[PDB]
Structure formats: C-alpha cells, structure tokens
Curated annotation (Swiss-Prot), chains A, B:
Modification after translation (UniProt): Activity is controlled by protein kinases that target the regulatory region. Phosphorylation inactivates both ds DNA-binding and cofactor function, but does not affect binding to ssDNA. Seems to be phosphorylated in vivo by CK2 in at least 7 sites in the N-terminal Ser-rich region.
Coverage span on the entire protein: 63 to 127 of 127
Any one cellular-component term (Gene Ontology): nucleolus
Outcome of swapping residue 40 to G: Loss of ssDNA binding
Residues the record lists as N6-acetyllysine modifications: 7
Protein location: Nucleus
The gene coding this protein: SUB1
Quaternary structure and interacting proteins, as annotated: Homodimer. Interacts with CSTF2.
Consequence when changing residue 7 to G: Reduced ssDNA binding
Purpose of the protein: General coactivator that functions cooperatively with TAFs and mediates functional interactions between upstream activators and the general transcriptional machinery. May be involved in stabilizing the multiprotein transcription complex. Binds single-stranded DNA. Also binds, in vitro, non-specifically to double-stranded DNA (ds DNA).
Signal peptide: none
Name of the protein: Activated RNA polymerase II transcriptional coactivator p15
C-alpha cells in the first residue's frame, strides 16, 4: 500500500518476503513515466515504526522550538 | 535534537539555514564512538512531516492487514 507524504515522497507498507516493512522514501520518474524508488529512503520494521510514533510529541516539540 | 527509534536509527530535528528539517535515518558508529549519518535516510520539511503524521492511521491499518 502507498501513502503520499509530499511531491515525489511516499510511505510504502508491504509484506516483503514475510516481514512487514514501513518504507519512507523519495521517488524519481523515469523516462517511461514510471515512478521509481530513489536512494534517499529508510525501511523500518514495525517495532521501529512504533518507536517513531512514541517519539512524535518530543519530535513535534523540537520542531516548534527550533 | 535526536530521538532514537531503534538500534542505530534516529529522527533528528534541526534548523538548517533557517529551515527546520525532520530527518529519519540510519547511523553508523565511527572509531571514536560517535554516531555519524548513513546514506539510508530521508529529510522531511515540516509540511511533509505533518503529512506523514496525517497518514499514520491509514499506514497502521495497512501494517495490521499485512
């Protein structure tokens, strides 16, 4: 499943060979008009994704102060 | 500011040329014990971070389905 988070930037949630991965990444468009995953991305497992969610208040506090 | 989300994986928030960036990335440890940013990460501006958070309920439904 794909969820857009900006221009050319998507979260992908898939079962990759038996393990669920939450992938946050930049994409390019190739000359054939297809969207292709770029190198600037990170693949998280469900535990790491849950830790990101637990850190949202603290991340948001830093965003509003910096 | 750095917020750990797994072994060697952190969300950073910083001000960069008067712009805030929320960076989700893998880190290495150098020979002096310092964490240094790896290639596998993505840098989001506040608007994209906001859009990722807006998509969390749907991302989570997909993680549970898969």
């Amino acid at each position: 499943a794909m969820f857009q988070i900006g221009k050319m930037r998507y979260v992908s949630v898939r079962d990759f060979k038996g393990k669920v991965l939450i992938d946050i990444r930049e994409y390019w468009m190739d000359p054939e008009g297809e969207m292709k995953p770029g190198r600037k991305g990170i693949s998280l497992n469900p535990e790491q994704w849950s830790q990101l969610k637990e850190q949202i208040s603290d991340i948001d506090d830093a965003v509003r102060k910096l």
